[PDB]
């Protein structure tokens, strides 16, 4: 009950209850302007996720799949890369 924060408390006054609620309403107007619609579209996007497919193979251009060192520190393909898309045959 004799803490430093309480000891120096009267020398650092707070800068001066319904105005707080008015400010909360003012900020919540901008919150609800973009809040529910983004959550709704993101919850739609979580269910239209890894179901579509792409079969566009990419020719092995010199700027594609740089291998200045052999492989990667974790393995052969890239991280987070389920399906490589650059042609490994080329033809």
């Amino acid at each position: 009950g004799e803490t430093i924060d309480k000891y120096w408390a009267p020398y650092f006054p707070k800068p001066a209850a319904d105005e707080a609620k008015k400010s909360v309403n003012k900020e919540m107007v901008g919150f609800m302007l973009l809040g529910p619609v983004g959550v709704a579209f993101m919850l739609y996007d979580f269910a239209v996720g890894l179901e579509e497919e792409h079969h566009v193979t990419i020719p092995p251009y010199p700027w594609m799949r740089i291998r200045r060192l052999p492989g990667m520190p974790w393995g052969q393909d890239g991280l987070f890369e389920g399906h490589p898309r650059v042609a490994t045959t080329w033809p």
Binding site: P59, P60, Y61, P62, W90
Partner: protein
């Protein structure tokens, strides 16, 4: 006797002249596609890129053309 080299292209003003090399190399094959093979302008473009581009760059560009990895239309 007089020696003929690549002329100054106003389109390429910087000290790095790699783009002048590339555009002349591409204008040669565009001339070859459009205006025949023995047109004087195509020979002008050929001597123009041969005068600017290093031989290693050119041979890398024909191996990319032969492998099919050239992004030009023609």
């Amino acid at each position: 006797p007089e020696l003929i080299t690549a002329p100054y292209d106003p389109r390429f003003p910087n000290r790095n002249q790699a783009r002048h090399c590339f555009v002349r190399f591409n204008e040669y094959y565009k001339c070859l596609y459009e205006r025949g093979e023995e047109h004087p302008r195509c020979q002008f473009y050929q001597k123009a890129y041969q005068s600017l581009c290093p031989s290693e760059w050119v041979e890398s560009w024909q191996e990319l053309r032969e492998k099919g990895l050239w992004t030009g239309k023609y």
